[PDB]
Design a protein around this ligand. Structure first.
Ligand SMILES: *[C@@H]1O[C@H](CO)[C@@H](O)[C@H](O)[C@H]1NC(C)=O
Ligand SMILES: *[C@@H]1O[C@H](CO)[C@@H](O)[C@H](O)[C@H]1NC(C)=O
Ligand SMILES: *[C@@H]1O[C@H](CO)[C@@H](O)[C@H](O)[C@H]1NC(C)=O
Lengths: 437, 101, 437
């Protein structure tokens, strides 16, 4: 047997599906999602960290001269200064008054710990939902991992389920993101090979073990001060260290729908958007013959109490005449009210009680026993507690029922006005028809 | 800090984040006199309730005015021929119903 | 200096860019695409290969009875046959004539070489262009591997180049593709966990080294013949081997625009579609001060022989009056004719001859030397060879030039008709004004 329903994508909501198949007694299947994941696909653009300036011992040539030599290093600089007199220590280090030159060179490398402390610039494309659902019906109770697309098919006690694609294409991530230790930033990083000094990505590398090392750090050598051996230079400080202060607020702190942005596999756990279409193919043995189920006649529904709070703040009672002791499956055919139970024990003493949840002042819904249908109307009252530590057990349907307290007044007033209008119309029409001829 | 019906979350120190929600509490009586029901719904949804009540009041006044105008026109049509006839002997019974001088 | 052009995505087409910076002599920069790759991003769905049926030795209990226990193996069958008399060999193997049960058992396993040959089912998303361009100007001769998106920036001899996103989002791959050894199929494989017997996907597995093995091979276990030990069964043959016979024509055989679908990193190399926007940042050392540039006076262009073939079928000579020797830079300001040379040689008293390529009977285009200019017109005869082994060195611009042979006839005829029409207009106006008196 083939059946298709739509369940909301909210974690913890107890969803219940009713299957009515000719020849058998109705089946109620309860099935709720226990967690959700949403992983984008990531293309690594480059890797950035803090740099390390390499500065070797200067070359001094007493009574001589030198020549600058280009090299393959990143941000490499080299200069030769014309007349020096170093005075190394306990002496002058040259016997040569004015014909001495110093060779000063420096270049930029990667930090010795860049494989531990670095950030990664990514590009995020279409993500894939991946849920975890608990299915309960009859006497099976099992939770399974699925992919929320039309592809993955799972089996639970002989029934096949396909949890169709999410109705929403929303995603918390942008095109470009930056991922540090445990947090994610919707950031717009520089192009590769065009980084700038003192800002994020002033040195770049395609991977951790890559060997390119673009570097733009504004390194610059300076002439040594007269009488001492040293190699002065100036250089803009690290842009990774600047970013580690001025980065801003992470996606972790500000994510819509209560997404929980998580670790190494970049994912958004437990967002609350959209609906999940699901189609099931139940075996023939999962149902009960009508001749083997109790017969319910003269079903009547009366509501004991009614408080439209977040939890199950209503109680209703059903009175009936039965023929034998058995189990019946209960269902609410409107989403104004959410039953807590999926089945009930039916006994000769025709009384059964169920708890439901609603958010309306005057709910009105049809409840069903195994082979019975009845209408339940109520008058709920608002709660007194302002704040609660849990989420609502209902779909937030507020509009009052027709023939409730609030809408009965509208009906009566509209009836009075309409009666007056039709009386006026009849008077005018009769007068005009009589006076015409 | 605001706690809507959608929910709210706060994080304080090295503790785990805490989530709170808001119930549909209000002031007034859902099943009372019409002003009490109006006050209840204004407690839940202020702007929508104001708009709905104003719209319904305008519609009711429009209906009343249209009906009264139609009776006025009907009375005019029924009584005006007698105002043209030189004799002008209006029946007293029809004067009673249509307030004829 | 910043300059931006648009080059076509055609491998081997010689493209030439013109840069005219005030205060400097114009510079012609030529750059051509050498290679092209277009790689989608793939999400592996599952793995399929040939299966293996495992049939252990049957268990025969003489003078007793057996009972069968279900296991968790894929496609597992177990059956008990009540009255047997096996007759093992040189004997009967049992004493009781009718109280003997055989326990038959079989299941399905993944092949021994499933890691050495199998088919992967993927899902293909947005693809990334990645070209290999050779740039030439002045004395530089380099080819760079670059990513064709607005991001990657690269420097060739001091000039910074950025090759922007392609103008079209065409891809040769579908949403679902199957990858066998070296060939790619645009094929719509079954969902995971819903494969059918005898067809591609009768056994599935998420990864080569995974351990799930969904199997649906219609295994079925039969009753042994009297007096003989054997496990008879029937089963549908492998769907992977069936697919290898009836898999169709690969994407390699049919693929638009001359794509060459290639190996392990699934890519579509050397397709010819779209244009590539380019942006460069030239230094001052690239140009030449307009003082050094020879001054060209009285430039005239005349075409000796022209045929509009695929190669450089045209020849033109420029006559000029100069003041000094040097190297100018030529350019064609209309894509109706494509020049072969970038730089010329201006001599003290002489001409310069250049070859061009066109597809039009009567092309008209403007050719420039260092800073002079001229207009060229020609009459070109069609080629003789029907078929050539190389692609056109031009853009297929066939519309002729106004004042050409074919259009001047229309000019004269329409002018005569217009003269007749305006004469008639004047005659009617004169008549209707003279009679107005
Ligand atoms: C020794 O000193 C003289 C000048 O004092 C200098 O020209 C010469 O190069 C020096 N030789 C060595 C080996 O240092
Ligand atoms: C289903 O099994 C889980 C596993 O512990 C249990 O927590 C849950 O209460 C069970 N549901 C029912 C209805 O018994
Ligand atoms: C250098 O450029 C010339 C064209 O002028 C080309 O033929 C040659 O292949 C280039 N050099 C190399 C090593 O490819």
């Amino acid at each position: 047997y083939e059946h298709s329903t739509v369940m909301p994508n909210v974690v913890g909501f107890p969803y219940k599906a009713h299957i009515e198949r000719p020849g058998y007694s109705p089946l109620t299947l309860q099935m709720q999602v226990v967690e959700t994941s949403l992983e984008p696909t990531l293309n690594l653009e480059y890797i950035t960290c803090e740099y390390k300036t390499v500065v070797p011992s200067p070359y001094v040539k007493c009574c001589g001269a030198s020549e600058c030599s280009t090299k393959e290093k990143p941000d490499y600089q080299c200069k030769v200064y014309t007349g020096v007199y170093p005075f190394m220590w306990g002496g002058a280090y040259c016997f040569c008054d004015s014909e001495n030159t110093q060779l000063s060179e420096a270049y930029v490398d990667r930090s010795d710990v860049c494989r531990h402390d670095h950030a990664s610039a990514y590009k995020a494309h279409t993500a894939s939902l991946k849920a975890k659902v608990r299915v309960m019906y009859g006497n099976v109770n099992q939770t399974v991992d699925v992919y929320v697309n039309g592809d993955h098919a799972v089996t639970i006690g002989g029934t096949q389920f396909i949890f169709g694609p999410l109705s929403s294409a929303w995603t918390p991530f942008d095109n470009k993101i930056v991922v540090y230790k445990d947090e994610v930033f919707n950031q717009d990083f520089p192009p590769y090979g065009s980084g700038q000094p003192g800002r994020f990505g002033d040195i770049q590398s395609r991977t951790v073990e890559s060997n390119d090392l673009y570097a733009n750090t504004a390194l610059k050598l300076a002439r040594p001060s007269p009488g001492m051996v040293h190699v002065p230079y100036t250089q803009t400080p690290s842009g990774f260290k600047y970013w580690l202060k001025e980065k801003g607020t992470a996606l972790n702190t500000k994510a819509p729908f209560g997404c929980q942005i998580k670790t190494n596999p970049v994912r958004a756990m437990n967002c609350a958007v959209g609906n999940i279409p699901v189609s099931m193919n139940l075996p023939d043995s999962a149902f009960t013959r009508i001749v083997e189920a109790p017969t319910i006649i003269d079903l009547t529904c009366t509501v004991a109490t009614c408080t439209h709070s977040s939890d199950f703040g209503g109680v209703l009672t059903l009175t009936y005449k039965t023929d034998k002791n058995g189990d019946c499956s209960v269902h609410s055919h409107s989403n104004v009210a959410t039953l807590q139970e999926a089945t009930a024990k039916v006994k000769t003493a025709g009384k059964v009680t169920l708890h439901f949840s609603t958010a309306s002042a005057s709910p009105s819904f049809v409840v069903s026993l195994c082979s019975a249908r009845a209408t339940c109307s109520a008058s709920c009252e608002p709660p007194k507690d302002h704040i609660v530590p849990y989420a609502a057990s209902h779909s937030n349907v507020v509009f009052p029922d027709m023939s409730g307290t609030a809408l009965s007044w509208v009906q009566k007033i509209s009836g009075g006005l309409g009666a007056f209008a039709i009386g006026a119309i009849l008077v005018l029409v009769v007068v005009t028809c009589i006076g015409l001829r | 800090i605001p706690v809507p019906v959608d929910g709210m979350e706060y994080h304080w120190g090295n503790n785990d984040p805490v989530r709170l929600w808001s119930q549909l509490t209000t002031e007034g009586k859902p099943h009372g006199w019409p002003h009490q029901i109006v006050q209840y719904y204004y407690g839940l949804y202020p702007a929508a309730t104001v708009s709905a009540v104003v719209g319904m009041s305008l519609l009711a006044l429009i209906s009343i005015f249209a009906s009264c105008y139609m009776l006025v026109a009907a009375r005019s049509k029924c009584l005006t021929p007698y105002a043209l006839t030189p004799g002008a002997a209006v029946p007293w019974t029809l004067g009673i119903l249509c307030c004829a001088p």
